[PDB]
Amino acid sequence: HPAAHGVLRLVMELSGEMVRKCDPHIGLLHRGTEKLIEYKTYLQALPYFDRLDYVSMMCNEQAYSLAVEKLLNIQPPPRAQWIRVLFGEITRLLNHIMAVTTHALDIGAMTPFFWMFEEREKMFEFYERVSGARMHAAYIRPGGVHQDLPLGLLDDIYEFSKNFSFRIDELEEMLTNNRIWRNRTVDIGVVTAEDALNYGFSGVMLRGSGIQWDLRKTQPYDVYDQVEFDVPIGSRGDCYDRYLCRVEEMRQSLRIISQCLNKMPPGEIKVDDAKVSPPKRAEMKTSMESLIHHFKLYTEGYQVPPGATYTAIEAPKGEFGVYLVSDGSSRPYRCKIKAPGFAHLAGLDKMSKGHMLADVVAIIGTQDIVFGEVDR
Amino acid sequence: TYKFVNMREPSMDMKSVTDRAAQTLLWTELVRGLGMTLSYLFREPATINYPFEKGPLSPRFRGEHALRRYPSGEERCIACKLCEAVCPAQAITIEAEPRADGSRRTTRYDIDMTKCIYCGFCQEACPVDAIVEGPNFEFSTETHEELLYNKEKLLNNGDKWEAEIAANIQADYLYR
Amino acid sequence: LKKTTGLVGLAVCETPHERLKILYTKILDVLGQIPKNAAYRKYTEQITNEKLGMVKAEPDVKKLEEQLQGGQIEEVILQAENELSLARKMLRWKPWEPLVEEPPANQWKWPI
Amino acid sequence: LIAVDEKLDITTLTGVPEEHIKTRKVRIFVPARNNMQSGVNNTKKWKMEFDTRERWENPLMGWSSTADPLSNLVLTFSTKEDAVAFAEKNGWSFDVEERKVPKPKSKSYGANFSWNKRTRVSTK
Amino acid sequence: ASATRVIQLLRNWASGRDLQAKLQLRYQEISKRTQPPPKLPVGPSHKLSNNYYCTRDGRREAMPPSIVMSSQKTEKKAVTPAPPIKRWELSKDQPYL
Amino acid sequence: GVRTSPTGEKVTHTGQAYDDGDYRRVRFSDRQKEVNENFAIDLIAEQPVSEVGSRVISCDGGGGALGHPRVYINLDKETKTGTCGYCGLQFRQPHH
Amino acid sequence: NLIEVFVDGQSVMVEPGTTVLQACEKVGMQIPRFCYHERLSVAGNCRMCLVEIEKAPKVVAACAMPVMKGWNILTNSEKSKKAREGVMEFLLANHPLDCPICDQGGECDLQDQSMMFGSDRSRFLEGKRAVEDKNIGPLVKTIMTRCIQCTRCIRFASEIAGVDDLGTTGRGNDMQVGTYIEKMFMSELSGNIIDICPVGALTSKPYAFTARPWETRKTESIDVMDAVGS
Amino acid sequence: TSVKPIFSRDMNEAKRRVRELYRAWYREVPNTVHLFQLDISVKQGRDKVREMFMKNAHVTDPRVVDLLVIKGKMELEETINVWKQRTHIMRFFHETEAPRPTDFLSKFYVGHDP
Amino acid sequence: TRPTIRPRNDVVHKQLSAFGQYVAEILPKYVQQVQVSCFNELEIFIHPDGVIPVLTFLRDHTNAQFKSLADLTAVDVPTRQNRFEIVYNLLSLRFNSRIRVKTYTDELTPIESSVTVYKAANWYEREIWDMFGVFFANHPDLRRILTDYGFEGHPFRKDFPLSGYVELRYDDEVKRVVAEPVELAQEFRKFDLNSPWEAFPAYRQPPE
Amino acid sequence: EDNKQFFGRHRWVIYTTEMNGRDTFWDVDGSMVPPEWHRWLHCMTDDP
Ligand SMILES: CCCCCCCC/C=C/CCCCCCCC(=O)OC[C@H](COP(=O)(O)OCCN)OC(=O)CCCCCCC/C=C/CCCCCCCC
Ligand SMILES: CN(C)C(=N)NC(=N)N
Ligand code: SF4
Ligand code: SF4
Ligand code: SF4
Ligand code: SF4
Ligand code: FES
Ligand SMILES: [Mg+2]
Ligand SMILES: [Zn+2]
Structure with missing residues (x-):
């Protein structure tokens, strides 16, 4: 189904076209990612996180890296942290473009889809320049980032950010004050603050319902405590308010990107500890200790001290969490992935009470579900 | 800090009420959207003329694999199996034995390109730059079996793309 | 006074002080049935008397909200209702009794 | 709280096929130290693994194929009693191998230079 | 970009903004595809002296969790997991949209 | 340095060649067998031997950080050449 | 009687x-070692097992120092x-930088103890030492640039196998292990020197280059070539 | 040792639940054959229900019986609601699996399997 | 400066320890243990039948307003008598904190459903049942959520094979997708990676 | 090459009508370019 994102079976009971109940049948994209992660090492399990929410890829990588570094008791260097924050905001822009345009396409509008996907193409070029892969970069790793930026990336990112607010403005010219869009979205999928908190919603759902909560502000990670930005807050808790929150979050991510570009520091890109991050190729090819550590890291992997951690980040779709359990070996004993869309899709049935088929389509769009992360 | 996305109230003066009534009766914002789409109609399209034009790529791009050689012609791979150990998807199968001249060289080197996830760990783990991910990405086949590369196929890819592979590695080897 | 609380589904109360006093008094009455030595009773009685003293001391809503540090006055009332329901349930559960059962010998060992 | 005078058995709930429930003999053992290294950190936990089954050669590409779901399955247990309890409740047959620890040895550097004993070394 | 002056005027009038100021097509304003060779820094642990791994070992400083209370093993004020979160301030840059 | 089997099938540098009675040769009918023509063993044999006047020499394969790990070869045995085993390169001391 | 330490x-x-x-x-603490084997004599020359006694100003060789009454052995101290x-x-x-072309590879005590007990960086800015390779028969392959002069093979040869054709010739940094002549170390107990050598200097020649330790599956069986039942 | 019962306390109540589940499955086979357009007979479906019930006849723990009837109710509701397809219903019948030999001589001929 | 070592927060460590003592005093009937990890995470080990009282206290109490259920999973540890370890991750927005509550259970022992305290527990407990076999007593609708229809076995258990026991293909004779025993063209190559040299002395266990 | 066109359209190739032994008058592939011109066209370098 075009509106079902490919791998959702929504068993719906309809009285006429009014929706009597929704019974989301998921697992059509369940792969066994957690079992496979148990069978891989810590470096081999990074692309699995790359492919979970395949619209916020560097965000998933950052969450996994933060969890592993917390268990390892190491600290990424400042330049690595600033690169992580910059690309996390670029990833947030990518994800919010995808969310808004696909929501508007399920409504019926396609020109914004095409425009903002041209912008997505430019950001994909940035991804490919740093990493060599257009989406599944596998660039953010425990201990920092894999490689340093090429010598024109910051200038090109500055140009892109310079010419992007106009694209957001053109997007808003077609949707914000359009009475058809307002009729389709206003007072659709209203969720109260208490209901959102109990059902376990996070991120844009809470902010649209009016709860003042954001992990980047309350529980900062990396260098998010050194950047200034505003947290959009909704009032009516409906699709229109969540759309406004997402657009304003795109603008605030532009703010953060500008600050990162101006404040990028010099230095190294990974923790200067060859027992966790690999040494450089020249050191590997000239130094015996470096060659030994390269061999051991790429065959067995670093050992992680035993323990369990739950680390969460403010991914573009809400709170993305990882509960990682290590038994002192080079391979993770347990890895539970908390995708924010799981709870939202669980709450889909309540939000669609007393609505119609088109309303349910709009509600799915405003929840912004990725079934890769839902099913894992 | 935080901001309210939608908490403004409209003024109730007669001029503003008349303006809103005119917007309701005369579809002002609808005409505005029409004007935006007309502007995009008169702008320049952003389409490249594939296959006669190609999108930009970088020296870091990960495409089809290749096995390199030394400038003397000797194969770089020494059957160390680091790439096989580090491969996330277990796409590499390597079997080796001493050669006739006593070198440590591979007899079997298979990559299942239907199992590979094109992550580039193998070229990071290689201590002699033998296995690389070349710039080629247009290698789609008509049968599944043709995607099960072996040592002869990978060596042919390396010999065919050696110049471009060497140029890319020269460009990007100072960042590694 | 204020038009909205800013939270969907949470209405504004015209009489915050009286409602808060009623809820705190009900909470204190319910806690009187819990045994005196129960650790639950002492702490919640302390916090309720601390918050009941504030509501009877500050007539201004904004100053009272600043003093309580519990968000808005409607949020404070909702939290009082939740605390009252929890007090009733804890009276039913009786969790001050000694431990039900110690776990097996190696039940929380890690790594293992 | 009911009382059952029965042995625990969850074979009907595990979902394993009857063939792999009945015809499988797991081996509970402590792994032997790899002779190539002097470390002894891999000889501390009991392991449970299944008997080897057939592996043949794939006609295409010559890979090694298998039909045994439990070929790569190895479980780690802290104690022999725990391992045996798990094997019994899951219904597989089992063979238990007692742990082998090196016996204490009397070492003395001064024995290398004995006045009249054969322990004197001819080199250093 | 390459366009007629009348077409540019019609685009500006219809869109309401000066499009040439913010173009979505890149005309020679991007960085060159060939760059001078870089020289990346080394790091903080590349010293030849006073640099012992025992003093910069993150993993070996990890400790098992501290057992605050175990079953096997005055008037205290009631406490909270953390001090209550302070109320957010309304943005000065743009409080309302 | 490709070689032809008695069945008309090319022999790979690893010696692979399907037997006469092997049924697996059917996959090559109406199609071709992928064999690389260049043989690394032949090329490295074609390479000459570098004479250096030192007891120990170092090889990194050429290119520095683009070669292989640097290794040291001891040129003391006069009955044979010292071979860098990463790149199979032979070195010798000036005799006579 | 037992003494308390x-x-x-x-x-x-x-x-x-x-x-x-x-x-x-x-x-329950395994001290790092290279030259110590419990089946051989005590040599105490690699110096890898040095530990600190609580009051002693000087570290002692753990493999050769007998314990005294009331000693506190600080295994994980700063001095250790x-x-x-x-x-x-x-x-x-x-x-030498031979790890990828070395059969010891992933089962090397030098690698593992370097990753656990050593530093992660190198301060050696000089040239390395290269040693001529010896030949001791068709079973054992010697690449003696990887030797760390632990004298395990010498002690094993003499004490266990009763064959005194292994030793050290020369002295200083140029000390070498070998027979000093073209002699083959042929004995019924030769591969055990392949096992006990902590580095890749002595490796199995029939097994050369075939596999890596992490790939292989270990099956615990017994021996049928003789009636001992190894 | 007293253990927390899932349901049924003793074994007789577990048998009662088993009989209720068997009746529910017995009255569902005609509707299943009709809706899924199965080419099998109603007698074949009832025989398969009987066979799947009989393979657990050796259970003597009431908690295991309770879990078995819970799973049976789950897979019955997957059939009444037509969540399952014809594919799964016919997966119950192993219509494509080749008959594995069971005698020692045939097993010896085919391969190394015990 | 120690740039490669994570800085520690003793203030947060002390706050978490104090709150752990507080809750352990308040609920002595169920709480068996309280721990604080050195990266400042509070962990509470309770008796399995105290799930509802402990969670209701942690949600409604004025000094612990853990209004959000961040996660709910289980861990399979075969070496234990009660192999399954149920973990609840709670987030308190009022005090900007997070807590963890862990209980234990085995194959045949049910755990009371917490859908009456948190509504996310519905799908979380359905997933726990689907992937581990743990039964939840008063669940509104307990069934498989992720596995295929009619799938037998609970995949996330340690004793379940990675590739399972069955695989799917389309059979032309019967004109439908069929399930047949698993058969791999290339067997998964198991690697023994653990080094035989102990890495972390701080975690060394007694020889016993 | 035409630098006046926007990035991506500034370089292009007109394929031949016969390569090796196949007539490519209408059937033109993206893999018909040698590796050096492939790099030049995909803009991994600015030097032809
Ligand atoms: C012949 C060519 C005509 C071409 C016209 C093209 C116009 C532009 C085309 C784009 C529009 C097409 C998509 C838009 C479809 C939907 C448009 C729409 O919504 O219009 C309805 C619009 C919206 O209503 P709501 O916002 O929902 O408010 C309801 C409150 N309960 O309401 C309308 O009815 C407007 C319809 C136009 C009314 C005509 C104006 C009346 C003015 C009267 C003055 C003249 C009086 C005559 C007497 C003269 C006395 C001297
Ligand atoms: C497959 N994914 C991720 C989609 N978003 N699909 C879609 N049709 N919108
Ligand atoms: S790119 Fe990654 S998945 Fe592909 S062969 Fe290399 S290591 Fe394996
Ligand atoms: S990492 Fe390189 S040298 Fe080692 S086996 Fe792989 S391709 Fe060969
Ligand atoms: S003996 Fe060990 S450290 Fe030396 S080259 Fe071989 S694997 Fe590397
Ligand atoms: S050859 Fe091996 S066993 Fe002999 S002294 Fe050298 S390192 Fe020790
Ligand atoms: S092990 Fe003691 S000095 Fe070598
Ligand atoms: Mg050896
Ligand atoms: Zn060389």
Whole structure:
């Protein structure tokens, strides 16, 4: 189904076209990612996180890296942290473009889809320049980032950010004050603050319902405590308010990107500890200790001290969490992935009470579900 | 800090009420959207003329694999199996034995390109730059079996793309 | 006074002080049935008397909200209702009794 | 709280096929130290693994194929009693191998230079 | 970009903004595809002296969790997991949209 | 340095060649067998031997950080050449 | 009678004549080692097993120092860690960069103890040492640039196999292990020198280059070539 | 040792639940054959229900019986609601699996399997 | 400066320890243990039948307003008598904190459903049942959520094979997708990676 | 090459009508370019 994102079976009971109940049948994209992660090492399990929410890829990588570094008791260097924050905001822009345009396409509008996907193409070029892969970069790793930026990336990112607010403005010219869009979205999928908190919603759902909560502000990670930005807050808790929150979050991510570009520091890109991050190729090819550590890291992997951690980040779709359990070996004993869309899709049935088929389509769009992360 | 996305109230003066009534009766914002789409109609399209034009790529791009050689012609791979150990998807199968001249060289080197996830760990783990991910990405086949590369196929890819592979590695080897 | 609380589904109360006093008094009455030595009773009685003293001391809503540090006055009332329901349930559960059962010998060992 | 005078058995709930429930003999053992290294950190936990089954050669590409779901399955247990309890409740047959620890040895550097004993070394 | 002056005027009038100021097509304003060779820094642990791994070992400083209370093993004020979160301030840059 | 089997099938540098009675040769009918023509063993044999006047020499394969790990070869045995085993390169001391 | 010693403050009763290494083994701590094998004699020359006694100004060789009454053995002390780092630095300073072409590969004690007890960086800015390779028959392949002069093969040869054709010739940094003549170390117990060599200097020639330790599956069976039943 | 019962306390109540589940499955086979357009007979479906019930006849723990009837109710509701397809219903019948030999001589001929 | 070592927060450590003592005093009937990890995470080990009282206290109490259920999973540890370890991750927005509550259970022992305290527990407990076999007593609708229809076995258990026991293909004779025993063209190559040299002395266990 | 066109359209190739032994008058592939011109066209370098 075009509106079902490919791998959702929504068993719906309809009285006429009014929706009597929704019974989301998921697992059509369940792969066994957690079992496979148990069978891989810590470096081999990074692309699995790359492919979970395949619209916020560097965000998933950052969450996994933060969890592993917390268990390892190491600290990424400042330049690595600033690169992580910059690309996390670029990833947030990518994800919010995808969310808004696909929501508007399920409504019926396609020109914004095409425009903002041209912008997505430019950001994909940035991804490919740093990493060599257009989406599944596998660039953010425990201990920092894999490689340093090429010598024109910051200038090109500055140009892109310079010419992007106009694209957001053109997007808003077609949707914000359009009475058809307002009729389709206003007072659709209203969720109260208490209901959102109990059902376990996070991120844009809470902010649209009016709860003042954001992990980047309350529980900062990396260098998010050194950047200034505003947290959009909704009032009516409906699709229109969540759309406004997402657009304003795109603008605030532009703010953060500008600050990162101006404040990028010099230095190294990974923790200067060859027992966790690999040494450089020249050191590997000239130094015996470096060659030994390269061999051991790429065959067995670093050992992680035993323990369990739950680390969460403010991914573009809400709170993305990882509960990682290590038994002192080079391979993770347990890895539970908390995708924010799981709870939202669980709450889909309540939000669609007393609505119609088109309303349910709009509600799915405003929840912004990725079934890769839902099913894992 | 935080901001309210939608908490403004409209003024109730007669001029503003008349303006809103005119917007309701005369579809002002609808005409505005029409004007935006007309502007995009008169702008320049952003389409490249594939296959006669190609999108930009970088020296870091990960495409089809290749096995390199030394400038003397000797194969770089020494059957160390680091790439096989580090491969996330277990796409590499390597079997080796001493050669006739006593070198440590591979007899079997298979990559299942239907199992590979094109992550580039193998070229990071290689201590002699033998296995690389070349710039080629247009290698789609008509049968599944043709995607099960072996040592002869990978060596042919390396010999065919050696110049471009060497140029890319020269460009990007100072960042590694 | 204020038009909205800013939270969907949470209405504004015209009489915050009286409602808060009623809820705190009900909470204190319910806690009187819990045994005196129960650790639950002492702490919640302390916090309720601390918050009941504030509501009877500050007539201004904004100053009272600043003093309580519990968000808005409607949020404070909702939290009082939740605390009252929890007090009733804890009276039913009786969790001050000694431990039900110690776990097996190696039940929380890690790594293992 | 009911009382059952029965042995625990969850074979009907595990979902394993009857063939792999009945015809499988797991081996509970402590792994032997790899002779190539002097470390002894891999000889501390009991392991449970299944008997080897057939592996043949794939006609295409010559890979090694298998039909045994439990070929790569190895479980780690802290104690022999725990391992045996798990094997019994899951219904597989089992063979238990007692742990082998090196016996204490009397070492003395001064024995290398004995006045009249054969322990004197001819080199250093 | 390459366009007629009348077409540019019609685009500006219809869109309401000066499009040439913010173009979505890149005309020679991007960085060159060939760059001078870089020289990346080394790091903080590349010293030849006073640099012992025992003093910069993150993993070996990890400790098992501290057992605050175990079953096997005055008037205290009631406490909270953390001090209550302070109320957010309304943005000065743009409080309302 | 490709070689032809008695069945008309090319022999790979690893010696692979399907037997006469092997049924697996059917996959090559109406199609071709992928064999690389260049043989690394032949090329490295074609390479000459570098004479250096030192007891120990170092090889990194050429290119520095683009070669292989640097290794040291001891040129003391006069009955044979010292071979860098990463790149199979032979070195010798000036005799006579 | 047993004497009481302390390992990291934990009491343990050991027989007199027990070494520091064996006391730590009894309390469950395995001290790093290269030249110590429990089946061979005590040599004490690699110096990898140095530990600190609580009041002693000088670190002692754990593999050869008998314990005295009331000693506190600080296994993970700063002096012990620094001693291990220094010894590993010297070893890896002269070792060759042969890990990818080395059969020892992923089952090397030099690699594992370097990753656990040594530093992560190199300060050696000089040239390395290259040693001529010897030939001792068709079973054992010798690449003696990887030798760390631990004298395990010498002690094993003489003591266990009763064959005294292995030793050290020369002295100083140019010390070499070999027969000094073209002699084959042929004996019924030769591959055990392949097993006990902690580095890749002595490796199996039939097994050369075929596999890596992490790939292989280990099956515990018995031997049928003779009636001992190994 | 007293253990927390899932349901049924003793074994007789577990048998009662088993009989209720068997009746529910017995009255569902005609509707299943009709809706899924199965080419099998109603007698074949009832026989398969009987066979799947009989393979657990050796259970003597009431908690295991309770879990079995819970799973049976789950897979019955997957059939009444037509969540399952014809594919799964016919997966119950192993219509494509080749008959594995069971005698020692045939097993010896085919391969190394015990 | 120690740039490569994570800085520690003793203030947060002390706050978490104090709150752990507080809750352990308040609920002595169920709480068996309280721990604080050195990266400042509070962990509470309770008796399995105290799930509802402990969670209701942690949600409604004024000094612990853990209004959000961040996660709910289980861990399979075969070596234990009660192999399954149920973990609840709670987030308190009022005090900007997070807590963890862990209980234990085995194959045949049910755990009371917490859908009456948190509504996310519905799908979380359905997933726990689907992937581990743990039964939840008063669940509104307990069934498989992720596995295929009619799938037998609970995949996330340690004793379940990675590739399972069955695989799917389309059979032309019967004109439908069929399930057949698993058969791999290339067997998964199991690697023994653990080094035989102990890495972390701080976690060393007694020889016993 | 035409630098006046926007990035991506500034370089292009007109394929031949016969390569090796196949007539490519209408059937033109993206893999018909040698590796050096492939790099030049995909803009991994600015030097032809
Ligand atoms: C012949 C060519 C005509 C071409 C016209 C093209 C116009 C532009 C085309 C784009 C529009 C097409 C998509 C838009 C479809 C939907 C448009 C729409 O919504 O219009 C309805 C619009 C919206 O209503 P709501 O916002 O929902 O408010 C309801 C409150 N309960 O309401 C309308 O009815 C407007 C319809 C136009 C009314 C005509 C104006 C009346 C003015 C009267 C003055 C003249 C009086 C005559 C007497 C003269 C006395 C001297
Ligand atoms: C497959 N994914 C991720 C989609 N978003 N699909 C879609 N049709 N919108
Ligand atoms: S790119 Fe990654 S998945 Fe592909 S062969 Fe290399 S290591 Fe394996
Ligand atoms: S990592 Fe390189 S040298 Fe080692 S086996 Fe792979 S391709 Fe060969
Ligand atoms: S002996 Fe060990 S450290 Fe030396 S080259 Fe071989 S694997 Fe590497
Ligand atoms: S060859 Fe091996 S066993 Fe002999 S002294 Fe050298 S390192 Fe030790
Ligand atoms: S092991 Fe003691 S000095 Fe070598
Ligand atoms: Mg050896
Ligand atoms: Zn070389």
